């Protein structure tokens, strides 16, 4: 039941006491800590809450434009029904996503507060539209560790870049 504080340094997402997962943030030319105030770039540094409650399929906002609605939980991407352009766009989501929310004022006020809509997701592209792309095995570890626990399940992540290295953890499919 103990709280879990994940850490993310731009290349590695750590679950303390369990393991290290490859992870990536930002579009290809924006995977840098000095770009974190540019839309779709590396996520701003700070503290975020994860919504890990499993809520099934994500809502579809506009099917013609391939638009998914926001949801505060762990949801799935409807890849099986994708057609045409949505086969392209929803491959950038992957199969699973977990909503993030800024968890203090300093994080929320970052970048004039102009950025938002953050998630952890399991596409295998080697980039992310302003979110955190993680190795897919993370979601299977998450399931195994949480489904046997009865009590409270509290997950956060701290984002902190400690060098100028590219915020790319090698998540592109091998």
């Amino acid at each position: 039941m103990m709280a879990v504080r994940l850490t993310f340094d731009g290349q590695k997402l750590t679950w303390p006491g369990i393991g290290i997962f490859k992870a990536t943030t930002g579009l290809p030319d924006l995977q840098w800590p000095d770009k974190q105030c540019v839309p779709d770039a590396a996520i701003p540094e700070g503290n975020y809450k994860l919504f890990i409650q499993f809520q099934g399929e994500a809502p579809i906002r506009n099917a013609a434009d391939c638009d998914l609605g926001p949801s505060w939980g762990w949801s799935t991407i409807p890849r099986g029904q994708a057609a045409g352009t949505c086969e392209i766009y929803w491959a950038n989501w992957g199969y699973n996503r977990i909503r993030l929310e800024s968890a203090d004022e300093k994080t929320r006020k970052a970048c004039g507060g102009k950025r938002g809509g953050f998630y952890i997701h399991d596409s295998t592209k080697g980039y992310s539209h302003g979110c955190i792309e993680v190795e897919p095995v993370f979601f299977r570890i998450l399931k195994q560790e949480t489904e046997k626990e009865n009590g409270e399940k509290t997950f956060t992540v701290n984002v902190k870049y400690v060098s100028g290295q590219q915020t790319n953890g090698g998540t592109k499919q091998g």
Binding site: P70, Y89, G117, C131
Partner: peptide
Amino acid sequence: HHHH
């Protein structure tokens, strides 16, 4: 906030 969109992602495409």
